[PDB]
């Protein structure tokens, strides 16, 4: 049984998701004095979270109905706070730095968890791990160079919260056998609840509605962005169903390279060659960790 459909699906869902995200965040709005840049990162994350929650509910209703979720409710909130914070920090970063920087920062996930395990928890790591971070750091340092700006601090906070979310998810999976769909649904529900509370409290839901009134065309794009975000995870899960995790690791590893490649060159940025080499070197750093698993 050939399985190109899942690989395709992922590469056609998350790729377009990135395209819509770039359009929504960095998209030029207005002319002259009408340059009202998209500063409403909370509302889009809220929409994405609710769409993900509904899709996960559908998947649960259609798959593994017999499974019983043993995870405690308060566990989901603890991971969800960092999950939501990581999204808010990452999406907000687009307000100050170009898309390639954000995606590369997202590819920098190993450093937080690796740093924690090696220096905070005092756990030795193999040689390959101790060199993956070095290669990635060299690549990003070359890429970055031509107090600090908000974009870099936002990216750092996003990485820290992503590491915290990863460790919390690891703990809950280990000690509660939480399913993929159940965790997705629950963390999305908690995130959307907290985001609704905050957004209505801060009031920019009204201001976001005003912005939509000024530019009505945004709503058709934000909905599609959320739908693609949900479908990406839905098809990622489908890969496990069709075939075991051996394919899941491969698809994740190849996506972590294809997404950055497309966002770098296929996005048609005005990148100078002096900068592209840095992307090349971080590529030579990226994936090398997956070489040793």
């Amino acid at each position, epitope marked *: 049984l050939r399985l190109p459909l899942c690989f395709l699906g992922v590469f056609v869902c998350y790729f377009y998701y990135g395209i819509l995200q770039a359009k929504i965040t960095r998209g030029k709005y207005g002319e002259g004095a009408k340059q009202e840049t998209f500063t409403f990162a909370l509302t889009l994350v809220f929409i994405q979270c609710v769409i993900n929650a509904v899709f996960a509910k559908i998947l649960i209703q259609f798959f593994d109905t017999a499974r*019983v979720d*043993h995870t*405690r409710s308060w566990l989901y909130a603890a991971c969800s706070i960092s999950y939501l914070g990581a999204m808010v920090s990452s999406n907000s970063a687009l307000q100050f730095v170009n898309y390639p920087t954000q995606v590369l920062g997202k590819s920098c996930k190993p450093i937080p968890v690796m740093l924690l395990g090696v220096t905070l928890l005092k756990k030795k790591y193999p040689l390959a791990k101790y060199l993956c971070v070095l290669l990635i750091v060299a690549g990003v340092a070359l890429f970055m160079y031509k107090t600090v700006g908000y974009g870099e601090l936002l990216l750092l906070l996003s990485l820290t919260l992503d590491g915290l979310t990863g460790v919390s998810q690891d703990h809950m*999976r*280990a*000690h509660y*056998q939480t399913g993929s769909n159940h965790m997705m649904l629950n963390i999305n529900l908690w995130s959307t609840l907290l985001l609704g509370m905050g957004i209505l409290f801060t009031g920019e839901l009204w201001e976001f509605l005003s912005f939509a009134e000024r530019y009505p065309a945004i709503i058709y794009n934000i909905l599609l962005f959320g739908l693609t975000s949900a479908l990406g995870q839905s098809f990622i899960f489908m890969t496990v169903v069709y075939f075991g995790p051996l394919t899941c690791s491969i698809i994740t590893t190849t996506r972590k390279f294809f997404t950055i490649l497309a966002s770098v060159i296929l996005f048609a940025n005005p990148i100078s060659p002096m900068q592209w080499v840095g992307t090349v070197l971080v590529f030579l750093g990226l994936g090398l960790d997956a070489k040793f698993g």
Partner: single-chain antibody
Amino acid sequence: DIVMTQSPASLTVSLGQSVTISCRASENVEYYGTSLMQWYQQKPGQPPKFLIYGASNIESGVPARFSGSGSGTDFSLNIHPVEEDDIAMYFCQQSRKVPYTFGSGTKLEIKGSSGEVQLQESGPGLVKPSQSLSLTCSVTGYSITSDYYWNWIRQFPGNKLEWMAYIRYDGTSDYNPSLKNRISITRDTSKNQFFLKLNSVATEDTATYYCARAYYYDGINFDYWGQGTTLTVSS
């Protein structure tokens, strides 16, 4: 489902010796690098007492003598300074598949021969075949609406355990697939009880039924047990 095999059926030990009990599962019980294994110690005519969950995670209050080991499909339990108290039966349980299964049990013998929950089982003793039956487990000192699983388990003659079913405090209930069409578990929170109803009990159902309180961590651990009620089905 997963079958657990305990190779040493009966172990003859002398006090002070180090004893190891082996338990092999049919399928890999590893889930995300965590073993979903538990161990229980049963004295004659007593409910099992929970000892270990996963790999070497000794339950609080258990002596330091016991230690679990092994991963994948093969597991072992080691008692290095064996003492008089440890002479009992030992059961290995897996919590990787929705039917939780216990091993046949390994029996040790010696040569030369309010801060808790009170569970109380009740039900008819002797029953004719084909009659519907209903056992009631009443809980005192705790509210079944608080966070704890409440399970019905049974033990046939020969000391073979079989997890019948359970109900969670949310009202979510899980059944043994082999018995999903013969039993039903319900609860009454007003009186703090839960009932197990069996339809058309046959001679094979003769056994001792326990109601237990369990908490999920590294699997399912039946920490608290009732005294158990004997049920005999005969014509």
